[PDB]
Amino acid sequence: GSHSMRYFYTAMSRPGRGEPRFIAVGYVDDTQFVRFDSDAASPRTEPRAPWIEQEGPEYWDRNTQIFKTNTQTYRESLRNLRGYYNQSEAGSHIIQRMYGCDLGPDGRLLRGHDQSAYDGKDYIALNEDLSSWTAADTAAQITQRKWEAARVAEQRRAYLEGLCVEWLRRYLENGKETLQRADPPKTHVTHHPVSDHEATLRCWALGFYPAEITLTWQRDGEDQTQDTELVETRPAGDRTFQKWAAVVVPSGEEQRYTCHVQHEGLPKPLTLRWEP
């Protein structure tokens, strides 16, 4: 199927409590595979998935050098943005970066990504052309004009179309037994009386990978979007995910309700009912 690689960087200032912390994590699809934390006793890039362990010392050392340099760069960035927004040195602020590459089912590049945010709001993004920028405000325009002068977009394009895809394809092969295995949800419906005339129907999906899933309720074949409580998809801790959707129904009308499940791991969408 389709696959992606992403790095997620968080840099957070903390006046009075030392220099800004830098954390980086890397994912292939919904599987984390590395981490780096500048607050670690001995900061170094660490494996977080079994299939990355086979990478040699040069891989780990080169990663660590990159992240240690980044730690310093983001400290410069935090200082710069503080100034661009005329902010006090007293406050704590966060820069985040997200970047990586998406492949289609045939392993070809679909598109690249490279976005940044300040205090949780979009700041600057590389456009899909991998050539031009979108700046959120006049502060980010300062960054834009700078990055334009230094031809940053060209460097990011070269990475996203080159190393990004090459390393992703490699990880996909080395981790093929898990990364290219979809685990379908285990599904069931539970029934919980609320009162004499109403009951909750809850449609469960458990043990699935990847996280993407569609879980809905219909009444007489019509979607119940407004009346469905749908919890965020949540990690089980064993690589898999969980989700449920619930409706409150009139007692006796349970068989008018059907829960519909779509997941890449399923040949065809599933239809479930409460089974007393």
């Binding site: 340099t69 410069e76 960035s77 600057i124 990055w147 460097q155």
Partner: peptide, 8 residues
């Protein structure tokens, strides 16, 4: 494998 960064 990660790319490099640059100051904002």
């Amino acid at each position: 494998f990660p790319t490099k960064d640059v100051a904002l």
